[PDB]
């Protein structure tokens, strides 16, 4: 390990992994550090389900999930226990306990916000949903010019299903997926357009689907090495990033002030360029310590002298959830086209179809899977085959019904009385509604507590805004309860429901992009540059300042890789010495 | 990949990483196939806690133990939900659902068994407990002379140890463990003897240990390379070894079918040697595959051609748990030495002891860690310093308490309303029986129903024996209320109950050792080779014929041991060319 | 039943659980107010919580 | 089978049953509170043995039913509250409230 490099990044998740990409690339000696360490096997940073045991057990993967969630703030439990023994010992006090956060409200919180360190960040455990925002999801990056405006977005939006092997085919010859596709198409006729939703993943085979991840974005392979012999990358695990040094006249960074965790050992890193991209969360708190802000509860009789908005406008989507189980009616149109002769488990039985009929309802394809399930599969009662894919349906956000919508299935931790139910017949709906910037919502940093790595305690102060979030999230609910009713009834044990504030993690808005610092009440600029700073970039969905209900970490990436345009004008790579 | 090797091993869990570690260092070409995958870093096979965050979070390593879990079988499910809407899609029968295996009589399972596919096997998660067996829970090695059959196991357990970095030290300056250790070893006074747990775990610093695994033992790195340039070893994740192949003679194995579960290709792999090390389960279930024992339902009329023991006798142990909260009394011993002067909070309150005085309780760096907690964290109200160990204290099996015990923490899912209770406070205890060993106590595999790679699908025909083994189970919970209750009264949440049966993972005695096949009703003899075969040779707890309460690891280890001493005095390295 | 139907608890102290599932639209409380006949007075952790 | 052990509570002047001067109950009457934790000392040692006692004494009829595992219960559910207007010989020196033959 150099101290001195051209550009240093903080993270590994799949946005620093997008200025690794981009600025390896382009000849830069790149060093990033990561809190984290290497947990997905050779391929560093990669998504952890793309085992085979996950493909054949997903439900599995909820706890691989669960195991690198850690709560950002947790409240002083006040839960009585009034059962212990009296020889043990008895709290007179509800005191702190438990690595518990004496700061944060209860009932202002963000419950459900949790953050994990491992090398890949979050993109190892994700879904991989990857849609665009519309127009009005979406913050400006050309100002009153809407052609030029959209043209970029597309430019950039490309750029990044690119780098993330974005598509919308994988699913296409599911029978689950059309059912549920097909019945929706023909309900909204008119009404609404629904598409698969779009996934950062290739399938390799029938029963094998390599979800995408930073490792997809960047290898995260040191270099110099075989294939890459004219670039320059380290990568250093188990490093805390603590702050950023700035010169007195805060119009530069200095240096990166780093903890090794194996060694103990604590340097300061010089580079010519810092990029932040330690999460919403943490790159806040990495400010924050840095000197930006304010430490400490929030107080606006003394404003910050650097960046006053950072922290505030923080937004969080609000999601509904519920589960179906297949209605008979769409259950009993798989095997429409099918003449059926026989009793299953005699010699008699027998399954036909007549393909090409025009009097089918459903193609070839179709009609030969569920041919060949009823008669290889006598003792079962379903027509789908067992190995048939989940469904991948969503209607993007409209004005008309303005949050995003999944309904599919992803890895879940099914009670014992719902695995009862066969699998096939459950779909799982998930909304997402766009929350209202607003300067009240805060994230701020305790100047006392200190969390896991003795840094300042992320405390949150937040309530989903009065007014159309709220009447939204809301028509949200009814819009879930109404669709999801033309597929099936609710399967018990997952009734439609609000789910935990954060537990989503879509936090947006923490260190919020716009054109004018003081006008647009912002962080970073378009380029992500952190105004006043000549060499500090910020990544990631904090830089997000709109309400959106879609999945942000495309767009997120997309800002991305605008920063990284900026950056390679700006600074001039070391020659390769 | 070449298909031609000295030795062939299948699976890379401790077992398979003992004979890797013995015959790659005896010069022998060794190839090693694991049906998991690499997945705990850079460290191949390594402890999946040995990483920071779980070394901070301990509590989250619970879900990376439950996500590679998956349990060997699953009852037919007969919960009634009678809450569907009536649109959905309903049940008349119920009909075999979600990999529920329709063989297993639900009131004869192990429910809780659970198998492992990861490369590493079970020691990427385990807890490292690695006792020795006293002689009676262990089986001859020699007979009729127990001073040599004492001084063999001493020889081999010693090597075992080794490998492991097996030690009683780790936990010796926690206050926690000390405090508990006195207590009882107090309370027991000439009746029964307390020491630490010992563990496969190296202490790196006051807050990391370093938890030992498969990868300790071997690093499972290919070779040859720089720091083992004369040796050959290659290992194959995502395989699956299906069968071996037998003579005409039943005296030789000829070829391992494998099928990689990457390309789909399927080989025949040729060796000198042939290990098997894939678990108690699935060694039993690849012998099944290949023609040794009988596939199908028990049939006694039909007697096997080969190995007519194999699957018989299965033992699995009873385990008890609960958890307490600390003593009132036992928190105030903690500062039995401190004079405490002034109010805490205050200017004036000062904590003081005396060093080395000879009426204190406590040595001195107790008293010091007791003083600095107590008197820089003035508003926490116990003496136990935040960051001290756990406890990790046993009494070991012997013939008046006829149980392993472990007194300790390890990895646990707190309610919240047990979250409310400080951890300091918490204790684990955990007894695990012995199972007398009974011809009726089954592991069978199906000839119609598979499992996920396809597979026959065990089944399991187990019922804990009555006689001894019961008496001892239900003495050993009441053991277990009245020891506690020295220590502190039950936490709530997690009062006294017996673990669902083998949730302990403990199987053992699927392919029982012994001296005479027929009169030891056994599967392998003392060198672990399959009776009737030069060249078949089996590892692991399957191997152990004695009911056994203590961790068998160490036990199928030192087996191991003994087994690579044959194979290296009866078959020759190729030449290295 | 017949039993439950008719002990009445002495002192419940005030509820302190967070309900944070509420629908956006739906009045939330600000503090854990003194709500459904709950005592102010009762130290939670010295009660007799099972007396009727 | 059902295990029930009832423990003896030692009575002590702090453990006390007041009532609100301002907050009322469902019959507009001045609301009950309780200031009680079992005593240290006999009581807290008794409670614990007997805790123990059951524990070892019902092992010998069967196994613990699941779901009906040994607990104490919370609190004062089981209704054998006394000692809120106690009786004694003499009013100061006995720390009561009523005569041997009841009377106040
Ligand atoms: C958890 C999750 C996330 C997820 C999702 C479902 C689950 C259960 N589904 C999504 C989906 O379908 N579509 C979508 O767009 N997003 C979804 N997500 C969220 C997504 O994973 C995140 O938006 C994304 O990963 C954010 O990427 P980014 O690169 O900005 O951040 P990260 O992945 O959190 O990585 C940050 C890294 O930085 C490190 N770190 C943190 N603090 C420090 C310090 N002080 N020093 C050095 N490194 C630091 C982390 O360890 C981390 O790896
Ligand atoms: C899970 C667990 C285990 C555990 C424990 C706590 C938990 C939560 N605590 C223990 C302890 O404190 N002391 C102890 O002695 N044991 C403890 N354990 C159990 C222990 O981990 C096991 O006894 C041990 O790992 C067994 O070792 P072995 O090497 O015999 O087997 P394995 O670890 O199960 O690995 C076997 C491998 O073989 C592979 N495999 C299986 N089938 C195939 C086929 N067909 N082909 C190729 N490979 C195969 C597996 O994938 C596996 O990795």
Redesign the pocket.
């Known amino acids: 390990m150099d101290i001195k490099y051209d550009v240093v990044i903080?993270?590994?998740?799949?946005?620093?992994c997008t200025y690794a990409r981009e600025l390896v690339g382009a000849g830069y000696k790149v060093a990033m550090?990561?809190?984290?360490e290497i947990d997905s096997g050779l391929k560093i940073g990669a998504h952890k389900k793309n085992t085979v045991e996950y493909q054949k057990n997903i439900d599995k993967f909820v706890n691989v999930?669960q195991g690198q969630?850690m709560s950002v703030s947790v409240p002083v439990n006040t839960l009585v226990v009034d059962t212990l023994s009296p020889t043990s010992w008895q709290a007179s006090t509800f005191f702190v306990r438990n690595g518990s956060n004496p700061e944060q409200d209860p009932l202002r919180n963000l419950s459900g916000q949790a953050?994990?360190?491992?090398?890949?960040?979050?993109?190892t455990?994700?879904?991989?949903?990857?849609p665009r925002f519309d127009r009005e999801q979406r913050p400006l990056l050309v100002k009153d010019d809407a052609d030029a405006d959209d043209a970029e977005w597309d430019r950039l939006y490309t750029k990044a299903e690119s780098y993330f092997q974005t598509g919308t085919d994988q699913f296409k010859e599911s029978i689950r997926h059309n059912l549920v596709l097909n019945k929706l198409t023909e309900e909204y006729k008119g009404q609404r357009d629904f598409q698969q939703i779009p996934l950062a993943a290739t399938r390799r085979s029938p029963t094998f689907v390599e979800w995408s991840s930073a490792n997809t974005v960047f290898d995260l392979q040191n270099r110099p090495n075989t294939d890459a012999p004219e670039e320059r990358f380290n990568l250093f695990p188990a490093?805390?990033?603590?702050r950023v040094v700035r010169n007195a006249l805060n119009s530069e960074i200095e240096s990166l002030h780093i903890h090794d965790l194996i060694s103990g050992d604590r340097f300061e890193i010089k580079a010519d360029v810092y990029v932040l991209?330690?999460?919403a969360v943490?790159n806040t708190?990495?400010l924050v310590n840095s000197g930006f802000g304010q430490l400490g509860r929030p107080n606006p009789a003394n404003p910050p002298e650097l960046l006053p908005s950072l922290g505030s406008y923080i937004t969080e989507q609000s999601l509904v959830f519920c589960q179906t189980v297949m209605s008979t009616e769409l259950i009993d149109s798989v095997k429409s086209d099918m003449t059926i002769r026989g009793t299953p488990g005699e010699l008699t039985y027998s399954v036909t179809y007549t393909p090409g009929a025009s009097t089918n309802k459903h193609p070839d394809w179709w009609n030969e899977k569920v041919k060949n399930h009823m008669m290889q599969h006598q003792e079962d009662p379903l027509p789908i085959p067992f190995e048939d894919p989940e469904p991948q349906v969503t209607t993007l956000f409209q004005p008309s019904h303005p949050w995003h919508t999944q309904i599919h299935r992803d890895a879940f931790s099914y009670g014992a009385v719902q695995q009862s139910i066969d699998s096939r017949l459950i779909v799982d709906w998930r909304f997402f509604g766009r929350t209202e910037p607003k300067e009240e919502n805060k994230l701020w940093f305790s100047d006392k507590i200190t969390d896991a790595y003795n840094m300042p305690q992320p405390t949150f102060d937040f309530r989903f805004p009065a007014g159309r979030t709220s009447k939204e999230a809301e028509d949200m609910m009814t819009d879930m309860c109404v669709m999801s009713a033309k597929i099936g009834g609710f399967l018990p044990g997952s009734l439609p429901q609000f789910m935990k504030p954060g537990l989503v993690?879509?936090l947006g808005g923490t260190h919020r992009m716009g054109f004018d610092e003081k006008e647009d009440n912002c962080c970073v600029n378009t380029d992500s540059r952190v105004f006043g700073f000549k060499n500090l970039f910020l990544?990631?969905?904090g830089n997000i300042p709109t309400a959106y209900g879609a999945?942000?970490?495309?767009t997120?990436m997309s800002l991305a890789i605008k920063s990284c345009e900026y950056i390679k004008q700006n600074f001039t790579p070391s020659p390769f010495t």
């Open positions: 903080v993270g590994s998740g799949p946005i620093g550090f990561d809190i984290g999930i969630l953050v994990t360190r491992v090398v890949g960040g979050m993109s455990h994700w879904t991989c949903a990857t490093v805390a990033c603590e991209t330690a999460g943490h708190q990495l993690l879509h990544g990631g969905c999945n942000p970490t495309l997120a």
